[PDB]
Design a protein around this nucleic acid. Structure first.
Lengths: 239, 94
RNA sequence: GAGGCGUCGAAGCCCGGCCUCCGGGUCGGGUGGAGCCGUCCAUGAGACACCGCCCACUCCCCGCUGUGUGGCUAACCCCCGAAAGGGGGGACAGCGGUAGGUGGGCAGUUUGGCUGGGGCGGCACGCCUCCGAAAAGGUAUCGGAGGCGCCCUAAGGUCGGCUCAGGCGGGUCAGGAAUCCGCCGUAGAGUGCAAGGGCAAAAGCCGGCCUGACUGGACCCGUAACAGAGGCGGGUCCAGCCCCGAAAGGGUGGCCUAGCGAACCCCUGUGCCUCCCCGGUGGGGGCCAGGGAUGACAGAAAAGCUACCCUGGGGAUAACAGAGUCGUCUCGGGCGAGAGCCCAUAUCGACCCCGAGGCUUGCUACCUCGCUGUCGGCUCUUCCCAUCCUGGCCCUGCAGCAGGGGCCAAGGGUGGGGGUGUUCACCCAUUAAAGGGGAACGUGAGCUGGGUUUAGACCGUCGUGAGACAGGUCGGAUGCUA
RNA sequence: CACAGGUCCCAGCUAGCCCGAAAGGGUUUGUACUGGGGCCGACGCCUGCCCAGUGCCGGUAUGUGAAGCCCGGGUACAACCGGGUGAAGCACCGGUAAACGGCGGGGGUAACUAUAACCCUCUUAAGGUAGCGAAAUUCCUUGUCGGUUAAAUGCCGACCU
RNA sequence: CAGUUCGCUCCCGUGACCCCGGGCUAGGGGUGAAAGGCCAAUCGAGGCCGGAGAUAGCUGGUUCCCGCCGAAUCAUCCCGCAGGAUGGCCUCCCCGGAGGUAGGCGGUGGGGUAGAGCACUGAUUGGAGGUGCAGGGGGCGAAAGCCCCCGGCCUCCUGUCAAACUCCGAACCCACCGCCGCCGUAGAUGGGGGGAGUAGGGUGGCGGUGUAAGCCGUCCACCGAGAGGGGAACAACCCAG
RNA sequence: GGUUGCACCGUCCGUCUUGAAACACGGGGCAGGGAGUUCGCGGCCGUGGCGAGGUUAAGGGGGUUAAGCCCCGUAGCCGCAGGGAAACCGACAUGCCCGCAGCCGGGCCGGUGAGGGGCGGGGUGCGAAAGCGCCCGGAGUCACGGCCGCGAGA
RNA sequence: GGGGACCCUGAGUACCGUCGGUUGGAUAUCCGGCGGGAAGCUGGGAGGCAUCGGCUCCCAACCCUAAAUACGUCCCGAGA
RNA sequence: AGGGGGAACGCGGGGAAUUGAAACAUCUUAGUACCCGCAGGAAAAGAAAGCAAAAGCGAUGCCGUGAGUAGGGGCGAC
RNA sequence: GGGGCGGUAGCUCAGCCUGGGAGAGCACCGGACUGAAGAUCCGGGUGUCGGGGGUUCAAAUCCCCCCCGCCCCACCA
């Protein structure tokens, strides 16, 4: 029958479906080598740079341990800003402190998933999380999705919004310019439609128009059968 | 279809005609029991031969009649040659 | 078991909790201070007389035990780190073993035969009957007619008496039927059911009795003629046990022929045999017989597509062409109903009957599948006449002009355009006329390659789907020095 | 075919998804302005109606539902036999078509010249809606009518069942 | 000329462009702007070697002479039909052993095809005479009223003819006995064993189907495997083995 | 013997086929190469040995340069008894009648008749019982060669 | 050589439970994975089902082992 | 003190399919082909929780025999 | 053939462990009511309650023997 499909190739490490990692220069960590606590650490905004690999603004921060690492830029940033880390940091835009010291109702980004790993959530350009509710048991944060997630208040996070936006998703205009975005990322494009790709290539279609099986597929089905609407709970929008 | 509840016919045991009392032949379950059952311990992976149950009907509208005729004079049953095919047997009084 | 219990303190009086079908019982306080009862036995069922264990719905302390859930961390594990340690979660989970469910995700396979080539349709694939079957027997076709895979426990068994549909006349009733009376009546009646044969002191009808539609083992024939050939069926015997009959004698189901099934495996009925040094027990194995499916029926376990295909073969077999064939087709001859005012034939001509041709269609499977390349056009040529024109002739309902009909005749001629890929067919105006047919449906080792038409694609229809189309449609090689 | 554009779908990252025999690895120097999968194919105007069936998803009282475990019978022990406990799964309920798909038949009836606006009925959940059409797929057929053409089985226009 | 060429013509020629060198992705896997296309002259799943002399009911082919006997192309079953097996049948050998009856006649049995017919089971054509009656027309009307009448429903001497009808029935086939004939003890009649082969055709008679040709039963000289002379030649027509 | 005229007759070869001179298939010509072999087992046959018995395998001794042949070895197999699921039981060294070969007597016939055929009785299994099945009046064993099946690449 | 108390005298073994692989291995082969889990020669195992009894043989959970047996590189001798 | 090589043979693991069954899946092919590690001149087995003709024997290979026998198996081929 | 659930008045059934002559609604019939159109009232009963037997004091349902429908399972013993 058929062979490995388009997603199945990605996982292999195939080079058409592998990101370049040498025109990339990203990542952000708050230095978890000195834990969440400890005021020992301050830095200076060294530069506002373009990160080529996230196609986004980034800020370079130069620490007083003498280490250069990126922190995701706020809006309104200007070089020569001071960023402070530790609980002894003042509550200010572009300063980083644990959740407990952060009051509710303020825009926040770059929150840790698990305490001491430099962020695992909210690292996207122009996108920001809002601190809705705070309890010393657990601090509830409102995600870019809209979903309230509970976090432990030992986690670090920074005050402000993330700079840019309208510049990480704007009109593609034409095929040439669209193409330039997919080299900056990794998505398989141009990709044809399954409906008139053979029943060897793809479960649906034939040579003619007509599907072969319905789009929405079981969640308990094996690999190599995740096509169409994958784990859908409902479909369409009109009768 | 109707047959009397008691009826006089030949008994080999006592070697004479006598009255017999009728009930149905009653057959056993499986799952211990037998040498054919022990043959179904090669269905571990035995998918083609005998222990895969050769999957096919077709599977016959009739059966024949099989009816114990039970002796009163010694209480031992017998089953014998018959050929009454039946699809709506009734036992009735007699 | 009609009596038992108590002055350690009881009814009976006064209240508290109390449940309820308010029936009446339980129960803590106290007055008390010595009885209350059942017997009678009412009561379908009898005694808080007393003595025992119990059955309803149900509730509670204690002992035992699961699961569900929340806390803990000591295992263990995920996160961060160069480590150190921290971070998070926690007996969840991760990991090992096992069970059910799901499971074209993947893989191995299959999807039958018969047959006017294949395929639809049908099955004549098992079996019964008449005819076909040629006056012994065997005897075929997708040969005619038409059925069986059950039904009845009397629709069986035996014996005695008795003989029928139907018709005729008489009675009764609406005619009629059941029913009655006589006369006629060799079988047309009835025998469950196809068909056929058989039969009248019966196998038909009735009454009574009865359940042999029995057990066992043969014999014979069909099956499958002769002549191999399993299973299965019947008939016919004897042995045994019954039944009925006065006995003789009959009954191995239904007058006979359809109404059935292997190898194996399992189970039943009954007894015994047997199970590894030896016994007891448990549990097994086995002889026989009975019952259970393969209905594609002398018995695989089973759905599709290939125009993306591949190979072995086959002219045993389809497409082109030919041969054969001539129903179909084309054309002719004979007879002359009938109208043509009248007058069958100036002209037109039914019903019916008999030939000729190979030019349409179809049948044939003969020839080719180690190829005999299709259609149309183009170009180039031969032949034929049942002759469109020209020549020569005859009639007329032929006045002329002009038609209509008939005869000879292939020497010559018989064109150009518009649509269709088009042979053919339709149309325009000319023409003396703008005739047809055969020649590998002439002519591709001469052209063209428009059409049939492959691997690419869309749409309509149908299909879960792959995918299909005498539906439409676009584009899709023409080899070779004679 | 691609395509810009459009839509629908899932997932809080100790994720979803997927690769590997294992050890591990991609997406990821990513973090919902993300990235993964289908469906359609700029722009303008629009996208009717149906969950009966098939698919997906959530829930599930009740019913059912394996092994493990438990109890009773058996057995001097064991096979074995009976019952409860019986999860996911299924019946069941709801939703869901820019998911697969479906989107119809007959009679009678109008002045009259026609026809049937009109009315009955029923399968199966619904009965074709905006449109467009004798289609590039009106069979029959070279429809019919016209334009162009002396002449057009064409083309184009129209009617359009 | 060339295992993809030549000329002319055509599209693109600042772009999602072309192009070099290094490196990367490998076989139910890749790669694919999606043709089931491509992955070293091989892709609807590459080449190499091993398994391996894969298997076939399928094509081709299988080698020196002579002598003797000398076929069947039918029958049952089969997921069997262009295939096997088992008979019939062919040959060779061995065993037992006396009759055998293809031929012809008579005696004793069986029979419905040609033919023939009305005597049944049977289908039906046609006019009479009954007016026996169910009823569509008329009359003394009381529209078939008592009673006659006319489609007519069914008797009767008649009337057409019959695979699956028969009051009947040859020629002819076949069973058996006797005889005669012929054959046989160099072994008949019969038994056992070994080794096979198991596409048919064809004229006539009698057919069944189908316009027919063709198909299929049956018996058959014959061809098949068998010459020669004659039919002009002409597998099976004649003469002849 | 080479070649040729006349009279007469004469459509290759092989295969395929119902039918081939073929418009069915295959062949330019000549030479060389070029296809029924081995093993096991079973069923047949012929010959040969021995006989109610027959036959030894492996091995070492032995002999020889080695070796074969020669001798030992009887392990083991088969037959001498069969029936039966097994338990378990267990037979005719021919009594009666035909008749071939042959012998004998008579003059084709009449005896005697092995082999053979036909009965009876017996052994065993099933069986209340009866009725059937198989078996029974001493020939096998081994060797050689060949014929054929089936298994193997065959 | 004979005298009393006979000596843990080998563990995830023996054996059993669940699932396979494999072999002729059949109830009765052999080994593996997962779970349970002994006894002390006074004891245990085996003899082709289980258990209990008789009888007989025999000691697992430590290790090695000459000689007789497989090859065809090579040398010689030989040919229906 | 070790890698690596070595004509085959030996030990331990991993382990197909065409084929057969006239098809096809158990079964058959076959514990074959093929792959990995490893030793020697033989290797390995090997001095008894053995056999079981209940009697007789006492480490272990191999050859002949037991025998196409027991048993397995679409109870079919094998 | 094994298990479970429902068949009750004309219909569909309630109680079935909650036991008796005993149920319920809705059709249907009768009566108001109305010019008509229209809406709403008031009466009636049809099964000891699917069959047949037993225990029980009065059991429809308990027990013993079952017909009919439906869902999950099953030839050669």
């Amino acid at each position: 029958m058929g062979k490995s499909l388009i997603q199945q190739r990605r996982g292999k490490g195939s080079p058409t479906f592998k990101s370049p990692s040498h025109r990339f220069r990203g990542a952000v960590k708050y230095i978890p080598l000195n834990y969440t606590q400890e005021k020992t650490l301050r830095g200076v905004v060294e530069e506002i740079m373009h990160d080529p690999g996230r196609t986004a603004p980034v800020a370079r921060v130069k620490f007083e341990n003498g280490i250069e690492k990126l922190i995701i830029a706020p809006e309104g940033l200007l070089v020569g800003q001071e960023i402070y880390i530790g609980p002894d940091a003042p509550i200010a835009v572009g300063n980083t402190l644990p959740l407990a010291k952060i009051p509710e109702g303020t825009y926040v980004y770059n929150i840790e998933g698990i305490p001491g790993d430099g962020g695992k959530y909210v690292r996207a350009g122009g996108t920001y999380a809002l601190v809705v509710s705070r309890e010393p048991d657990k601090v509830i944060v409102q995600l870019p999705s809209g979903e309230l997630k509970a976090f432990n208040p030992m986690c670090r996070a920074t005050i402000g919004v993330v700079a840019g936006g309208g510049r990480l998703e704007k009109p593609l205009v034409k095929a040439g310019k669209a193409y330039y975005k997919y080299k900056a990322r990794n998505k398989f494009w141009p990709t044809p439609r399954g409906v008139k790709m053979n029943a060897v290539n793809h479960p649906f279609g034939g040579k003619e128009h007509h599907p072969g099986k319905p789009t929405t597929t079981s969640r308990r089905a094996p690999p190599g059968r995740k096509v169409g609407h994958i784990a859908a709970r409902r479909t369409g929008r009109r009768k | 279809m109707k047959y009397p509840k008691q009826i006089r016919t030949y008994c080999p045991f006592c070697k004479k005609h006598t009255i017999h009392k009728v009930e149905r032949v009653k057959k056993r379950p499986r799952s211990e029991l037998s040498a054919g059952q022990r043959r179904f311990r090669r269905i571990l992976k035995g998918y083609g031969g005998f222990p895969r149950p050769k999957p096919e009907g077709r599977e016959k509208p009739v059966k024949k009649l099989d009816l114990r005729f039970r002796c009163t004079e010694c209480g031992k049953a017998h089953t014998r040659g018959r050929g009454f095919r039946v699809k709506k047997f009734e036992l009735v009084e007699g």
